[PDB]
Short mmCIF file of C-alpha atoms and ligand atoms in Angstrom, two decimals:
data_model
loop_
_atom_site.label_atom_id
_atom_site.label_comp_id
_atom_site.label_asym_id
_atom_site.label_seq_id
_atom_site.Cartn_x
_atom_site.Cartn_y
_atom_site.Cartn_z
CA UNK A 1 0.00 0.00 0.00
CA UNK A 2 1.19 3.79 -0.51
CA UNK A 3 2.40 4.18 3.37
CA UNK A 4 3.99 0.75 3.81
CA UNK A 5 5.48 1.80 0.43
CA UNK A 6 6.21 5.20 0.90
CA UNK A 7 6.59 6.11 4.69
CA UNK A 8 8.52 2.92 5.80
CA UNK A 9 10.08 2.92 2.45
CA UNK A 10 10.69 6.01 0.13
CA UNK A 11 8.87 6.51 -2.83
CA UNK A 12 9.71 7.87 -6.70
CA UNK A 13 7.39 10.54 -8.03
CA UNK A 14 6.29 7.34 -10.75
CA UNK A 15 5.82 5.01 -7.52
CA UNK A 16 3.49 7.78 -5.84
CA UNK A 17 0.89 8.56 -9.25
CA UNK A 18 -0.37 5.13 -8.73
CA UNK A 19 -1.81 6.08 -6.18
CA UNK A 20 -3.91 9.17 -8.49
CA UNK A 21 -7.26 8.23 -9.53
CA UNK B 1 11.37 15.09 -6.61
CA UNK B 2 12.22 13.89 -2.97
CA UNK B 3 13.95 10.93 -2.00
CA UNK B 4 12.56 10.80 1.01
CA UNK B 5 10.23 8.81 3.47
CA UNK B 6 6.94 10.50 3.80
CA UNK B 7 4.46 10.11 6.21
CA UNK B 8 1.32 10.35 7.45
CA UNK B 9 -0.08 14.19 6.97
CA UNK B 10 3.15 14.78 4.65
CA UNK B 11 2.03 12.00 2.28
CA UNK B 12 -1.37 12.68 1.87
CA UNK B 13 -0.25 16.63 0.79
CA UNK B 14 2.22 15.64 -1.42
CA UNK B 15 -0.24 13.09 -3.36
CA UNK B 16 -2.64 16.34 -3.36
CA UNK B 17 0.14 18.24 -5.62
CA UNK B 18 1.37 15.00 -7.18
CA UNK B 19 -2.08 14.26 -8.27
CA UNK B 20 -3.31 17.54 -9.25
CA UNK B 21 -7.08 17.83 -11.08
CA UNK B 22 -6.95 14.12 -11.19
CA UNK B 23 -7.16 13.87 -7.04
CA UNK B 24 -6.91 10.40 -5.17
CA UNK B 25 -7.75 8.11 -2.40
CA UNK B 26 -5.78 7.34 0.82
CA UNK B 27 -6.36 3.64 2.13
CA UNK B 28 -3.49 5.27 5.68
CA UNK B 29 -2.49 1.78 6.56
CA UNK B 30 -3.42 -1.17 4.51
CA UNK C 1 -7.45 29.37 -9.57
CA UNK C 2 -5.62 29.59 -6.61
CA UNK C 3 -7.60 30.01 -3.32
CA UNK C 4 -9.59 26.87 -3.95
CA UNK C 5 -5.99 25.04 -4.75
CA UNK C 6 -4.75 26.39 -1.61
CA UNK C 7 -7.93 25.83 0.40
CA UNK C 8 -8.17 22.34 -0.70
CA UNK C 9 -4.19 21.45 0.89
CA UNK C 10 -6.12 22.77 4.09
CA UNK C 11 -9.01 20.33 3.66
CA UNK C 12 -6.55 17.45 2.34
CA UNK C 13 -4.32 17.81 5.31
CA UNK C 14 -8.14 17.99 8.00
CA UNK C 15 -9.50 14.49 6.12
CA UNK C 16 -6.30 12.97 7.10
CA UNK C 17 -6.33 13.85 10.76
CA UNK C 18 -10.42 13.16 10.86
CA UNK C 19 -10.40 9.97 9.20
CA UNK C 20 -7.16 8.20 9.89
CA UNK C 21 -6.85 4.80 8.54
CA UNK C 22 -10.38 4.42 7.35
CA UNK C 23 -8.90 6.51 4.40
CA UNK C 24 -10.79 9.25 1.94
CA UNK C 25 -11.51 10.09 -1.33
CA UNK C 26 -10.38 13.22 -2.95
CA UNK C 27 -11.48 13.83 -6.23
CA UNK C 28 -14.52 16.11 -7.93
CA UNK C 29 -15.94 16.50 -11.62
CA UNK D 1 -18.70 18.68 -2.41
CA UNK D 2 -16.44 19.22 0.10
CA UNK D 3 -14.55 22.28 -1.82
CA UNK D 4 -18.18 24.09 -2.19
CA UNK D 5 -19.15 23.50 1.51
CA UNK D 6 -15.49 23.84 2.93
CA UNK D 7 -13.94 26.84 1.27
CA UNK D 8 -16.86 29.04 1.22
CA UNK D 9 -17.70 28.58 4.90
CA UNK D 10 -15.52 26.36 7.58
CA UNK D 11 -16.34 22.93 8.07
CA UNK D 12 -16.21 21.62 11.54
CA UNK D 13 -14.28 18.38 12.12
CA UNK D 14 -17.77 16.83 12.39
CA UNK D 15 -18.95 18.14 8.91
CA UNK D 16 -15.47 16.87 7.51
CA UNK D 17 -16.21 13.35 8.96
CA UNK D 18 -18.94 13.24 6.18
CA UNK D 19 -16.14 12.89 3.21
CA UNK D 20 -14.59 10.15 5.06
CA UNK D 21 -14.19 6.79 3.72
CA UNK E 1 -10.16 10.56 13.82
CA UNK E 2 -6.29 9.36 13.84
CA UNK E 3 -4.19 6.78 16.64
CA UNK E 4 -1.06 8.42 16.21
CA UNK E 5 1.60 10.49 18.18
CA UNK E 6 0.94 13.98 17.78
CA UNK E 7 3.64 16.12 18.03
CA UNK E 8 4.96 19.47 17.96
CA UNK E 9 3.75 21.80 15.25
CA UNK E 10 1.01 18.43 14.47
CA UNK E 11 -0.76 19.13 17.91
CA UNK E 12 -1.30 22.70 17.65
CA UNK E 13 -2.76 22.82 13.83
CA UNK E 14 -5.06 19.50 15.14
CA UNK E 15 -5.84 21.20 18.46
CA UNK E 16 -7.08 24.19 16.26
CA UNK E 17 -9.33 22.07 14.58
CA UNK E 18 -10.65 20.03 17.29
CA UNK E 19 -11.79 23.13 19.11
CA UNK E 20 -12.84 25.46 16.96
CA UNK E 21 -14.48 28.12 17.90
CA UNK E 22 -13.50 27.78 21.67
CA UNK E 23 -10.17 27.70 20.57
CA UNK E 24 -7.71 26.38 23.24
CA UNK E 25 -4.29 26.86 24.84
CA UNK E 26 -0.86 25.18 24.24
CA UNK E 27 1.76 25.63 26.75
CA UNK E 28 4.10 22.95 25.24
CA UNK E 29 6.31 20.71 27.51
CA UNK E 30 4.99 20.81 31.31
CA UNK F 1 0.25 18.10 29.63
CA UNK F 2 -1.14 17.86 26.27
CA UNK F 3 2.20 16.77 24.96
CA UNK F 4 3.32 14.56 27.48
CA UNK F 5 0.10 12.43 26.47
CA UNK F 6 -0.15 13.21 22.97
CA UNK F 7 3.16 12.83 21.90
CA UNK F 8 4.82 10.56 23.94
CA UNK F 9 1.68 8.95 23.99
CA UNK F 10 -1.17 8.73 21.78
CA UNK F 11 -4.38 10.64 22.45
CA UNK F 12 -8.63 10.13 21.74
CA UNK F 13 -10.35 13.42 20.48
CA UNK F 14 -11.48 13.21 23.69
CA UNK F 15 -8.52 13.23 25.33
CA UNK F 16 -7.42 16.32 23.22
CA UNK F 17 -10.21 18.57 23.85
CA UNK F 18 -9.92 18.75 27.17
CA UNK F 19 -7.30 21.41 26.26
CA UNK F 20 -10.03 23.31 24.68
CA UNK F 21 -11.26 26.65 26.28
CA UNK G 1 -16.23 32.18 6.76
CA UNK G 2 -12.83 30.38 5.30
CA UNK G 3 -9.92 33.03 4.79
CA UNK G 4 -9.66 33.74 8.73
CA UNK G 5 -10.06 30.28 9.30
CA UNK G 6 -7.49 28.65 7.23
CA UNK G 7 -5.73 31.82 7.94
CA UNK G 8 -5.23 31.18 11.54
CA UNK G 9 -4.51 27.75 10.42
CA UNK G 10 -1.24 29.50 9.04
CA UNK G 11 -1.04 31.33 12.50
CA UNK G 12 -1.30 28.73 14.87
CA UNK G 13 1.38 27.16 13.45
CA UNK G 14 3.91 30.27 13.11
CA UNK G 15 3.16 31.16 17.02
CA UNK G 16 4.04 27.55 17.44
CA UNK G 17 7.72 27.83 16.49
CA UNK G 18 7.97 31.57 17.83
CA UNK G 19 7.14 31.13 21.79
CA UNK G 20 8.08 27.90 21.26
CA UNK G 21 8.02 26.70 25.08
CA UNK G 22 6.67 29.46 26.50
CA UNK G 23 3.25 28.03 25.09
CA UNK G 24 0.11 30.90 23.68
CA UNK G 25 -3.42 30.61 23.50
CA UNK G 26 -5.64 30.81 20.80
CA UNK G 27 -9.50 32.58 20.90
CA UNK G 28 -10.81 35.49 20.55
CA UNK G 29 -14.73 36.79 21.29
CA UNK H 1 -6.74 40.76 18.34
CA UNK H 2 -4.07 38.48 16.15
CA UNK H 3 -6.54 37.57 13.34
CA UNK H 4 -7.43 41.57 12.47
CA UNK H 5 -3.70 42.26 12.79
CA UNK H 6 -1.63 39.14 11.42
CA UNK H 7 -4.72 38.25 8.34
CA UNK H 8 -5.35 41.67 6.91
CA UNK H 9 -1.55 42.37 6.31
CA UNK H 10 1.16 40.34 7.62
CA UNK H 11 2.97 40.34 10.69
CA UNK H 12 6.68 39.80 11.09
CA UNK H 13 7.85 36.93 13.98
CA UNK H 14 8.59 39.97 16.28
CA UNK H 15 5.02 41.46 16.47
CA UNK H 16 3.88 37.48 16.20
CA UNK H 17 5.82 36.94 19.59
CA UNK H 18 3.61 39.65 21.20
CA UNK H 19 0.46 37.29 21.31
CA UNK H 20 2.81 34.82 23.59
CA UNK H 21 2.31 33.12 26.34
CA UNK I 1 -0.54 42.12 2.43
CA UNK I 2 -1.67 38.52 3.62
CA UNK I 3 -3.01 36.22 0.91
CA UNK I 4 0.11 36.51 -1.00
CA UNK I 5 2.25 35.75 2.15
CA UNK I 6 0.30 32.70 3.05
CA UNK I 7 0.11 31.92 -0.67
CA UNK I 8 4.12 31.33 -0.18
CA UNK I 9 4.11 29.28 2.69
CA UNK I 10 1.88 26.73 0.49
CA UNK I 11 4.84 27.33 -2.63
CA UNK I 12 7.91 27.33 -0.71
CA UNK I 13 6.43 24.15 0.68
CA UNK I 14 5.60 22.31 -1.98
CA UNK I 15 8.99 23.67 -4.26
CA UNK I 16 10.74 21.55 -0.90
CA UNK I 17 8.78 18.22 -2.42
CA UNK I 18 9.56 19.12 -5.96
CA UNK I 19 13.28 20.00 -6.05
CA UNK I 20 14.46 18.33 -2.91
CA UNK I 21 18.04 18.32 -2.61
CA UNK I 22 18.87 20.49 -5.57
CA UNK I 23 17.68 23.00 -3.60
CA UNK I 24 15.76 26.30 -4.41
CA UNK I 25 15.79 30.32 -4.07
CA UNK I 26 12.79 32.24 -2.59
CA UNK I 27 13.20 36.46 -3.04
CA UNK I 28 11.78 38.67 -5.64
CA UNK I 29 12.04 42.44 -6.21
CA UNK J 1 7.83 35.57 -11.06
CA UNK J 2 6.61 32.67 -9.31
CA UNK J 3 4.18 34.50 -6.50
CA UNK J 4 2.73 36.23 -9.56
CA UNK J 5 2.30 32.97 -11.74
CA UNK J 6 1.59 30.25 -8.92
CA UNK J 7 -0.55 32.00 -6.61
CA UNK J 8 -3.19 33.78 -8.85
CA UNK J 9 -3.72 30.41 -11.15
CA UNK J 10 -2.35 27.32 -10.00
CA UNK J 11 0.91 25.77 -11.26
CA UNK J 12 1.37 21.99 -11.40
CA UNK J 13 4.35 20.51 -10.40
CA UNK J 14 5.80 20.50 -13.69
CA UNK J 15 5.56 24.61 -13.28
CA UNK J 16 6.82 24.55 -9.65
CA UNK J 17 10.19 23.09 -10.90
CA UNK J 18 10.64 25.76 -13.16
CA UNK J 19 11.72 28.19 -9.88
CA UNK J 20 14.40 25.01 -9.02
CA UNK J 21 18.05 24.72 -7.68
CA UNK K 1 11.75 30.74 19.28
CA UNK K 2 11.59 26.76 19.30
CA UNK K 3 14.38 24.84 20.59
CA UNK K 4 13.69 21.87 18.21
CA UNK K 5 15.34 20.03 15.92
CA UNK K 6 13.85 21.43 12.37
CA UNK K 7 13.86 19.12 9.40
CA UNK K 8 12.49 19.06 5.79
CA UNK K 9 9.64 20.86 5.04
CA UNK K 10 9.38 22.36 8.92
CA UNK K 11 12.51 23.82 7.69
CA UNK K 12 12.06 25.62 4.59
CA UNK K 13 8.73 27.17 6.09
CA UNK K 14 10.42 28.38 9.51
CA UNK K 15 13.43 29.95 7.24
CA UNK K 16 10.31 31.46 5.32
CA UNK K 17 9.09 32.90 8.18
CA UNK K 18 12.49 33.90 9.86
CA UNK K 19 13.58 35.90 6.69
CA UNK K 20 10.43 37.72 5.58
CA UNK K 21 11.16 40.02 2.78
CA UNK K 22 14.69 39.11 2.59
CA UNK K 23 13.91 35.85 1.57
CA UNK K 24 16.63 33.02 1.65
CA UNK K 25 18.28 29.82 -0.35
CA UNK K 26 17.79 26.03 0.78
CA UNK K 27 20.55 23.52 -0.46
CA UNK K 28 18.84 20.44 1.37
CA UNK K 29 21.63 18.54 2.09
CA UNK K 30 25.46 20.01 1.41
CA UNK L 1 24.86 23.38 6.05
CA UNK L 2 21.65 24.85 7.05
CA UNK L 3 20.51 21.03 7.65
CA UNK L 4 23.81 19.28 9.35
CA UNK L 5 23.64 22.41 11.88
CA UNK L 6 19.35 22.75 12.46
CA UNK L 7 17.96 18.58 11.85
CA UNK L 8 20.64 16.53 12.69
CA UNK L 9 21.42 19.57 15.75
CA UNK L 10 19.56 22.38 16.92
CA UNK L 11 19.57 26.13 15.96
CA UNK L 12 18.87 29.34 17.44
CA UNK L 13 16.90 31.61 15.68
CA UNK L 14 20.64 33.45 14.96
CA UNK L 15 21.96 30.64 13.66
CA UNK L 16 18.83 30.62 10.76
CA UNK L 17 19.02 33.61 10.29
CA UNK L 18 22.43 33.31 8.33
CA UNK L 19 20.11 31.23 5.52
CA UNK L 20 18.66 34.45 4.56
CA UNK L 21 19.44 36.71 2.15
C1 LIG M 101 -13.16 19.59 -6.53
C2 LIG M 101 -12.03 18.94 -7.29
C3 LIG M 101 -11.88 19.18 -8.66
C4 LIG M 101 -10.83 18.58 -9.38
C5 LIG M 101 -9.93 17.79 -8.71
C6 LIG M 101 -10.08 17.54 -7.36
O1 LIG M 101 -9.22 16.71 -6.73
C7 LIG M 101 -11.13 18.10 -6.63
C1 LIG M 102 -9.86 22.69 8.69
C2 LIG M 102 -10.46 23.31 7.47
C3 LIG M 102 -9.57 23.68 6.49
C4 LIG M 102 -10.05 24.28 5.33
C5 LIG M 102 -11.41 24.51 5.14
C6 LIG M 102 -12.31 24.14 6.11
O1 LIG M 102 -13.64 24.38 5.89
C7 LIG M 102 -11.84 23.55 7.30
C1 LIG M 103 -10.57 35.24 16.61
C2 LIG M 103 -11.18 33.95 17.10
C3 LIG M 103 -12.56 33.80 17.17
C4 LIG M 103 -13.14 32.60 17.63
C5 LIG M 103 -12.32 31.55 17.97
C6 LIG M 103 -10.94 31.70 17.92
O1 LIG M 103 -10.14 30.68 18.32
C7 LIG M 103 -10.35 32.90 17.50
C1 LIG M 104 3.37 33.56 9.21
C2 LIG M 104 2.05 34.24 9.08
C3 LIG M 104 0.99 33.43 8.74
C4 LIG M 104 -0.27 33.99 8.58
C5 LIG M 104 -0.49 35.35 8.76
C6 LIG M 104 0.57 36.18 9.11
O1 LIG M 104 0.31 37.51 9.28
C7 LIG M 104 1.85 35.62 9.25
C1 LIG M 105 8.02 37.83 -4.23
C2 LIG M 105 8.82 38.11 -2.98
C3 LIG M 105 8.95 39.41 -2.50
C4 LIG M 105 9.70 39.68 -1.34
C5 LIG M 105 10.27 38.63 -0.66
C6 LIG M 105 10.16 37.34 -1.14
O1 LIG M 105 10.78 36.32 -0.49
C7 LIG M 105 9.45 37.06 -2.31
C1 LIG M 106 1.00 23.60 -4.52
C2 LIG M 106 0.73 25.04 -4.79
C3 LIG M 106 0.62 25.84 -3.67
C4 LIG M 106 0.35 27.20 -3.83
C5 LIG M 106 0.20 27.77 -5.09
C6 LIG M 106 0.32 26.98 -6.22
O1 LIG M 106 0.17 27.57 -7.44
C7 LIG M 106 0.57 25.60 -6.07
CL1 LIG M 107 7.84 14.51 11.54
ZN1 LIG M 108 -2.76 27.93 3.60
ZN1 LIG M 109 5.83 17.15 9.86
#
């Protein structure tokens, strides 16, 4: 999911659109 | 861009300007 | 279109603290 | 939605709790 | 609303919205 | 204080507005 | 009734790293 | 009080650190 | 002079996300 | 410059990193 | 003023507010 | 830098002030 992703891991800009509608 | 963790508040912001007209959905913790 | 731009990092940031976890949608039109 | 009924006039947290989910 | 430590600049903006009108006082560490 | 409990702990609504006016 | 709402938004948190310790309060009325 | 003064035009840390304490 | 100074807390903030370490400048005039 | 361009319309991102480094 | 350790974007926005009109320059990380 | 002195340590208001311009 976007936080275990991007909060315990970092995130690219790419890896954080997927998350857009 | 950021290489950096974001969190909580600080994520959902940064998917607001990442996302734009778009917009998005949080799920927090999955 | 700014002051509904900048409002809506105001409302983003409230959702988060309101809902938690259970998440939100944020999305119009 | 929210934007309309939010930016005009302030939403309490209560109100806000509405968009939630 | 959110289980999570609150802290620093994070309490007073979610104090502000939890009170509202009333408004409230922050007198940091105690 | 507030912080003591909400930041070195975690704290309910509840247990936030009782730092309300 | 927005602009002095999420204005003070924008206060709260600049009083916040100003006193610092010292604490402030927030209301008015 | 704050929001007539700091809202209308801005105020500077210095006169922010008058509404203190 | 307010809704242009709280308009640049939301932009310095967000130029932070966008440039990260390259870095940025934030003076006019 | 950018107060002039990004605060009465939007910018996206893309925009933003225009006023970068 | 804060006695706090300031990091990221509670950074940039404190600088904003401690320079005003002068303004200022963020490197991130040097 | 503004960071190695004011994240990883503290920093007086002074010491910020030397970021400006
Ligand atoms: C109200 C609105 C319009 C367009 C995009 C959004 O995320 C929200
Ligand atoms: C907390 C908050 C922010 C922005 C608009 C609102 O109506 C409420
Ligand atoms: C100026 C004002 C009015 C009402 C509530 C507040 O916290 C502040
Ligand atoms: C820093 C700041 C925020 C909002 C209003 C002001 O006058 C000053
Ligand atoms: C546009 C502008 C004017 C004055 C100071 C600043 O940091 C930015
Ligand atoms: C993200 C953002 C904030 C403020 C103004 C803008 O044009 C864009
Ligand atoms: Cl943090
Ligand atoms: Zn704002
Ligand atoms: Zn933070």
């Amino acid at each position: 999911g976007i936080v275990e992703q991007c909060c315990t891991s970092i995130c690219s800009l790419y890896q954080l659109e997927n998350y857009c509608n | 861009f950021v290489n950096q963790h974001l969190c909580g508040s600080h994520l959902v912001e940064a998917l607001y300007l990442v996302c734009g007209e778009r917009g998005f959905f949080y799920t927090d913790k999955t």
